[PDB]
Design a protein around this ligand. Structure first.
Ligand SMILES: [Zn+2]
Ligand SMILES: [Zn+2]
Lengths: 91, 51, 135, 95, 224, 104
RNA sequence: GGUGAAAUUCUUGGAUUUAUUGAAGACUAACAACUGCGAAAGCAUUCGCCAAGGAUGUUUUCAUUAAUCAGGAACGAAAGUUAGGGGAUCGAAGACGAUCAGAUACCGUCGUAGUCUUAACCAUAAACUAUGCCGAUUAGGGAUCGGACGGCGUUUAUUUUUGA
């Protein structure tokens, strides 16, 4: 009862569009439909609404994030360095 | 104001001339970087997302 | 024209000789890198082309450096001898030995000689490959 | 260190979990130490400390999230605040 | 190679050069190290503009007339120029290339550390320091090695000492501590309980940022 | 047949060691399979010192000698005659060559 | 500049060399050794946090719970593949300069993939001690790393114990 062996979420596309494109869109589609744990209230009730907007179903707060992920590696690195940079500069 | 900022920070929606209300980097996922200052005859050099 | 001083005190310069394994540069300037005083290379001294890195060419170059320098009104020199360095050999070229001593033979005062070859601390990969120059 | 001291309390002494129950207990005036998580709503945070100052009971700002505090009290659910009615043989109230 | 150069590319510029005198800061004895060259002052090009950004390399043995400290050379930056004289102050220290290589030897243990420091008054500059293990007169063992756990201990005290005495100082009084090697002696006497740690030295000093100009303080310390 | 009991490298008790560049050809060799030479040579010969000494800047002093450390791959080493082939029994002998203190 | 010696390439729009400041990426010289740790591949700058391990000490505890393993499983240098980031230095392919009768090479100037990193694949090496794992007995010696024990001395320590 696995119904597949490798296709996964990209099984709706049947036999169209070519193997490599189907396999390559899976990377973003699987993480876009997922569900993440909130940061303000702690519940696991965060889902995507628009192309860059995320919102918690329980506290009703809304946050601007990545395109297909609640956060992106580039943004996280910048915040850490900037926080480190500011503290030493003001000390 | 971009003069009260140390070198290395990334910003967005920069004004090409003070008051034009934002012209430089304002698309999805891009930024500009400051490189160095000039306290005398105040002027700042920046790097744009195209190089 | 050139400013004078009392007989007891003298004046100092510093020469920056660059002696690789293919040529030797004789180059005198003030206690700085600014205001070049004189500079002559082996290629205007020899014409055989087999000696451009020889001590023989070095002495010919050092002589005319010493000659033209003394009229400008310098009497003593500091010496800065440097090889290629970095990823190079760090061994001063053969000409370098001849040039430095030959200054005493010309009678110009020599003071405070030193070597400033640039040595790395865990540098990048170096030319040649994995098997080196295989000849 | 703080986790270890807290683990001992729940085995020996008695403790009450949750927002309303601590406020009722604090209201009775027989609390001795309250714990505050890090990601609680700021309005509750400021209100809880105000009651503590009035009752003259010490407050401790736990450094972890509300999920972590729960797993340190040994339960299987989230928790935001808690109150210590009495210590057992430990020494939390020393500092 | 006269034949070479087939594609190819007023004289005697010296007629417009001028020699100037240079002077040295307060604590040192001799304040005259040589002459310097520059084009003559003229229209379209002042002379102060060429002298406002130069630095000179002078040996501390020459400045102090004492051959014991003959392995450290320092650099001086020129700031202000009066009539045919250049006033200067401190701009860094350094050893000689050859000496650093003679210090290290096989069958020993080398310990190194680094620290930046700033005083109450604005002066950002960094200090370097080194030490070596010392043998025992009645020793037979040929290695003389310490243990890792011990090695980490040495640095924490070593790091602590430099900051403590360099916190409350000025440029003049800190230099007055460098010239008699107060740092090296204090380190030795503090680490003797754990391990000998011979041959302590500060390699060189280099500055990173400077405060406002304050010509008053320059002329206060210099030229008396 | 084994020619050396230590395989000519002297490494027993580790996986490998990071290599290094031969100071003559720039070949790569492991740090333990390398001929190392330490040298303490003067700036110049004694003959130069006398000319140097007469124009002494300060009192009477000697310009400090330099210290070098050279590392060679084995093929270049025995072409420059730093070391050479020994005999069947002379191979297994690791004492430094004795230096005559009187030179006849 | 570069070679056994030439030659490409670059230059008064100042090469090369000198000094101060800044940016990028890789790497932790010397100390470094018949010296250490890990199952192997491998692992070297400081500090903080997180978990792990051998030996030693022991008049603590359980009590045969053990050894090697067909199939089965985890890790597995370098090169190589798929998408991003980054791309300083070296440098497959390739273009030029020389040598040579020829030289698709060895010598020189550039230089793409790659060399770095993130998320996934590949599972081979002279992966060498060319020497499988557990256990018992058998000859003399001096060095060396970690722990413990005994001892006359020395060394410098708000010292004495301890350290060495
Ligand atoms: Zn929420
Ligand atoms: Zn070689």
């Amino acid at each position: 009862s696995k119904r597949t062996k490798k296709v996964g979420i990209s099984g709706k596309y049947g036999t169209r569009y070519g193997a490599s494109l189907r396999k390559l869109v899976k990377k973003q589609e699987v993480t876009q439909h997922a569900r993440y744990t909130c940061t303000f209230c702690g519940k696991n009730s965060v889902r995507r609404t628009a192309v860059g907007i995320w919102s918690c179903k329980s506290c009703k707060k809304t946050m601007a994030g990545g395109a297909y992920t609640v956060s992106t590696p580039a943004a996280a690195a910048m915040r850490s360095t900037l926080r480190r940079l500011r503290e030493i500069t003001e000390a | 104001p971009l003069s009260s900022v140390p070198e290395g920070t990334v910003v967005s929606n920069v004004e090409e001339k003070p008051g034009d209300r934002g012209a430089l980097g304002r698309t999805s996922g891009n930024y500009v970087t400051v490189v160095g200052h000039n306290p005398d005859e105040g002027k700042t050099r920046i790097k744009l997302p195209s190089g | 024209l050139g400013p004078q001083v009392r007989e007891g005190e003298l004046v100092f310069g510093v020469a920056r000789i660059f002696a690789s394994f293919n040529d030797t540069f004789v180059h005198v300037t003030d206690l700085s890198g600014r205001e070049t005083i004189c500079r002559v290379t082996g290629g205007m001294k020899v014409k055989a082309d087999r000696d451009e890195s020889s001590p023989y060419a070095a002495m010919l170059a050092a002589q005319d450096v010493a000659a033209r320098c003394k009229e400008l009104g310098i009497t003593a020199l500091h010496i800065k001898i440097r090889a290629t360095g970095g990823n190079g050999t760090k061994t001063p070229g053969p000409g370098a030995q001849s040039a430095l001593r030959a200054l005493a033979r010309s009678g110009m005062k020599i003071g405070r000689i030193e070597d400033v070859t640039p040595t790395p601390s865990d540098s990048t990969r170096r030319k040649g490959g994995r098997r080196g120059r295989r000849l | 260190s703080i986790g270890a001291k807290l683990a001992l309390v729940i085995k020996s002494g008695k403790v009450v979990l949750g927002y309303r129950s601590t406020l009722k207990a604090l209201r009775s005036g027989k609390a001795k130490l309250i714990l505050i998580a890090a990601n609680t709503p700021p309005l509750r945070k400021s209100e809880l400390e105000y009651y503590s100052m009035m009752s003259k009971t010490p407050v401790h700002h736990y450094s972890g999230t509300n999920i972590e505090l729960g797993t340190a009290c040994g339960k299987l659910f989230r928790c935001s605040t808690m109150a210590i009615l009495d210590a057992g043989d430990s020494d939390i109230l020393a500092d | 190679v006269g034949k070479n150069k087939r594609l190819s590319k007023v004289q005697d510029p010296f007629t417009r050069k001028d020699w100037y005198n240079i002077k040295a800061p307060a604590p040192f004895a001799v304040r005259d190290v040589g002459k310097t060259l520059v084009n003559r002052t003229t229209g379209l090009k002042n002379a102060n503009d060429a002298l406002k950004g130069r630095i000179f390399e002078v040996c501390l043995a020459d400045l102090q007339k004492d051959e014991d400290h003959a392995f450290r050379k320092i650099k001086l930056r020129v700031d202000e120029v009066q009539g045919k004289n250049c006033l200067t102050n401190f701009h860094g220290l350094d050893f000689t290339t050859d000496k650093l290589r003679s210090l290290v030897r096989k069958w020993q243990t080398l310990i190194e550390a680094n620290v930046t420091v700033t005083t109450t008054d604005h002066y950002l500059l960094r200090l370097f320091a080194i030490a070596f293990t010392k043998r025992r007169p009645n020793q037979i063992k040929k290695t003389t090695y310490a243990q890792s756990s011990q090695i980490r201990a040495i640095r924490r005290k070593m790091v602590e000492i430099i900051q403590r005495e360099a916190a409350s100082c000025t440029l003049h009084q800190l230099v007055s501590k460098l010239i008699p090697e107060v740092i090296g002696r204090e380190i030795e006497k503090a680490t003797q309980g754990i391990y000998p740690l011979q041959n302590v030295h500060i390699r060189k000093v280099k500055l990173l940022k400077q405060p406002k100009f304050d010509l008053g303080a320059l002329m206060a310390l210099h030229g008396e | 047949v084994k020619k050396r009991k230590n395989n000519g490298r002297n490494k027993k008790g580790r996986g490998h060691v990071k290599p290094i560049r031969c100071s003559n050809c720039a070949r790569c060799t492991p740090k333990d399979k390398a001929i190392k030479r330490f040298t303490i040579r003067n700036m110049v010969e004694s003959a130069a010192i006398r000319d140097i000494s007469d124009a002494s800047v300060f009192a009477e002093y000697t310009v400090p000698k330099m210290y070098l450390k050279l590392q060679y791959c084995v093929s270049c080493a025995i072409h420059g005659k730093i070391v050479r082939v020994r005999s069947r029994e002379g191979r297994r002998n690791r004492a430094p060559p004795p230096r005559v203190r009187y030179n006849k």
